């Protein structure tokens, strides 16, 4: 093959799900090539929207907007709640099933959280960092040394 | 053992300036494989290029004007009727 | 898919929410379906369809796929930076 996303089964699954038989191998290699590039493309765009929200854990709104800006159709139906399973299934393996269905009535009410209000304190009077108010103690010695580096004080 | 443990230990003879090793002084006085593999660098097949007719037309027009004035003879590509569908082509570069 | 996490690893983004891989895989499936569908139409077009003139036999070389993708990126897929225009 050429790259990731093995086209022997992935692209084969796609085409044989459509209802064809004759997809030459090199064609499916090139197809894997294209779809992987599109992945990196959308992924960088949603990163651009990620680091404006100044967060790290990319959410689905990032990629949804990243679609909306590529003049590309949106994608509905992916809620954060009701998490994922990826249940297994075997055939004489495929590792796919979704057993989260069979509802008849819902009558739940969402609970509102508090509004966004701010908590000032005092920190770093004239170089020294108090630990008495809402601050850390020397517990960053336990942090992961690539992260939160340096300490001079 | 430990050849770079300390500098070369020697003394210099004051008669002939030779560097002398200490033992010669008296006589002279007399898994991750897959991480390394995962460097795919995927590509697309085709890219668009936003280029209208007007910009390139004015450019090419003024170009061939000056080209016929100073010195086909312009700087042009060359594509074969066969084996096309590729993405970059050579150039004539005829002066 | 675990390989999707492996692909996430290329861009230093190890903070996903686990809905993204489902979603992007669904997306690529949709996209390639449309692609190799209209490429099959063009493979029919070379095979000269109407209300009964000939058969429909599939080969689907790479050129047809290239055609079916260039039409999509004719109105999609943020292209190379159009600097000179700007």
């Amino acid at each position: 093959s050429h790259t990731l996303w093995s086209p022997s089964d992935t692209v084969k699954d796609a085409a044989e799900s459509l209802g064809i038989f004759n997809l030459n191998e090199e064609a499916a290699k090139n197809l894997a090539m294209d779809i992987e590039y599109r992945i990196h493309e959308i992924l960088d765009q949603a990163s651009k929207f990620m680091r404006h929200g100044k967060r790290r854990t990319l959410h689905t709104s990032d990629i949804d907007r990243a679609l909306k800006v590529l003049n590309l159709e949106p994608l509905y139906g992916y809620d954060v709640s009701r998490p994922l399973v990826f249940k297994e299934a075997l055939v004489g393996y495929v590792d796919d099933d979704e057993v989260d269905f069979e509802k008849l009535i819902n009558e739940p009410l969402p609970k509102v959280p508090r509004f966004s209000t701010f908590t000032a304190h005092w920190l770093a009077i004239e170089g020294v960092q108090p630990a008495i108010p809402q601050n850390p103690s020397p517990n960053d010695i336990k942090n992961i040394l690539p992260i939160n580096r340096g300490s001079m004080e | 053992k430990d050849s770079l443990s300390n500098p070369l230990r020697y003394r210099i003879c004051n008669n002939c300036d030779r560097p002398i090793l200490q033992s010669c002084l008296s006589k002279h006085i007399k898994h991750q494989v897959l991480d390394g593999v995962a460097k795919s660098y995927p590509l697309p097949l085709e890219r668009k290029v936003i280029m209208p007719a007007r910009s390139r037309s004015s450019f090419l027009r003024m170009r061939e004007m000056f080209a016929g004035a100073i010195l086909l003879y312009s700087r042009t590509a060359v594509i074969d009727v066969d084996r096309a569908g590729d993405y970059y082509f050579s150039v004539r570069a005829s002066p | 898919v675990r390989l999707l996490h492996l692909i996430f690893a290329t861009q230093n983004i190890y903070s996903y929410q686990d809905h993204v891989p489902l979603q992007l895989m669904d997306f690529a499936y949709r996209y390639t379906t449309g692609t190799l569908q209209d490429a099959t139409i063009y493979s029919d077009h070379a095979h000269a369809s109407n209300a009964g003139n000939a058969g429909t036999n599939a080969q689907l070389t790479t050129e047809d796929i290239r055609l079916a993708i260039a039409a999509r990126t004719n109105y999609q897929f943020k292209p190379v930076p159009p600097k000179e225009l700007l």
């Binding site: 093959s1 050429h2 790259t3 990731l4 093995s6 022997s8 | 898994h31 494989v33 897959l34 991480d35 390394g36 593999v37 995962a38 460097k39 795919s40 | 675990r2 390989l3 996490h5 492996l6 690893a9 190890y14």
Partner: peptide, 22 residues
């Protein structure tokens, strides 16, 4: 996670295909 992820990827028989795409 990275080491365990690569080990689980090797759990699949496609470790060979992954090894060839260098």
């Amino acid at each position: 996670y990275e080491r365990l992820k690569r080990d689980i990827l090797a759990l699949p028989v496609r470790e060979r295909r992954r090894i060839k795409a260098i």
